[PDB]
Structure 1
Amino acid sequence: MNIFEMLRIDEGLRLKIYKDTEGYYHIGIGHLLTKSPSLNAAKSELDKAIGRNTNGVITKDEAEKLFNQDVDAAVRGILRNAKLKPVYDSLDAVRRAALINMVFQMGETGVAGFTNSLRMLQQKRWDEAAVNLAKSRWYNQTPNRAKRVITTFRTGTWDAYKNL
């Protein structure tokens, strides 16, 4: 199992513009188009990202292309982040995958704000962090996903994703 498979599970794959749980427009494999109300705005951003006139629809290859660029940017974001870097460098390979997942979903900025949970992960206090992490809007809005990542940090294995 790896980060691409993991996120492919959590995000799904939609070939047409769609709204995610917070009503924002996306496409592909959890690719944020725009934060605004305009489908037009969204269609606009989509064409600029793809480089062609899409008319709100893209191919699988196109989606995978944005996906690879997005995974790439999440990792780089973590590495350039003063609050995130040390945490990530202190973790094992599986746990690193869980942090990249969070970053991909809510942004560096949103993750760097889980201050207390970050300290706990850094100290290898697995069960304590998992409870802290669950005290969040993030867990209350998308509990099944949040749970999967959380057990992941807890246990350091892919158990939560096997059978998916």
Structure 2
Amino acid sequence: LRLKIYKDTEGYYTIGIGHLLTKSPSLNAAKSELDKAIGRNTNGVITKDEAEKLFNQDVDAAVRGILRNAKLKPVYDSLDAVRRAALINMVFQMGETGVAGFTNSLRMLQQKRWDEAAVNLAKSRWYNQTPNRAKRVITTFRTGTWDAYKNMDIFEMLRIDE
């Protein structure tokens, strides 16, 4: 959808399907990151094919972040496939270290206390800053369904949220 550099909900330079380029306030710094990611002089604009390539890599990266993380892996391993997509969604948005910080929520999720996990996940900066997205992800954790995305797989889910 967005094939030119934009800022994300935190004001950070981004392109494509939520591909964060840099936290630097320099648009030139962001353009340099873009060119390095794409492998050419893009001047701040990419193709659809390029956007989808970065997206595939970014999803892979989020899965790899979980599997390499001592706190996230055992939660991920305990979840069914639909709830695993909710966890990948969080990591995609906030990064592995950020999600690994939800210690209490992760525990509740591992215990399969879905309603209590949902309540705990909402007492977060995440929820207060991106409540509609957070509500969709949380409903996914609570129900183990894709109901919140009705009007599926992790790629489609992120295409919707991002």
Counterparts of 1:132 and 1:110 in 2: how far apart (Å)?
15
Identity of aligned residues (%): 99
Counterparts of 1:26 and 1:54 in 2: how far apart (Å)?
14
Question: Per-residue displacement from partner, 1:33-79 (whole Å, max 9, x unpaired)?
Answer: 00010000001110011010101000000000000000001101100
Q: Which runs of 4+ in 1 moved over 3 A?
A: none
**Is 1:85–2:76 an aligned residue pair?**
no
Counterparts of 1:59 and 1:24 in 2: how far apart (Å)?
21
**Is 1:140–2:128 an aligned residue pair?**
yes
User: May I ask how many residue pairs the two structures share in their alignment?
Assistant: 151
Question: Per-residue displacement from partner, 1:112-143 (whole Å, max 9, x unpaired)?
Answer: 00000000000000000000000000000000
Counterparts of 2:114 and 2:21 in 1: how far apart (Å)?
34
- Report the Cα offset of residue 101 of structure 1: 0.1
Counterparts of 1:31 and 1:128 in 2: how far apart (Å)?
32
Superposition TM-score, scaled by structure 2 size: 0.92
- Aligned-residue Cα RMSD (Å) equals 0.4
Superposition TM-score, scaled by structure 1 size: 0.91
SS at match of 1:53: coil
- Report the Cα offset of residue 111 of structure 1: 0.3
Unaligned runs of 5+ in 2: 152-162
Question: Per-residue displacement from partner, 1:85-113 (whole Å, max 9, x unpaired)?
Answer: 00000000000000000000000000000
Counterparts of 1:33 and 1:14 in 2: how far apart (Å)?
14
Counterparts of 1:20 and 1:77 in 2: how far apart (Å)?
21
Unaligned runs of 5+ in 1: 1-12
Q: 1:104 aligns with which of 88, 92, 111?
A: 92
SS at match of 1:130: helix
SS at match of 1:36: coil
Counterparts of 1:159 and 1:103 in 2: how far apart (Å)?
21
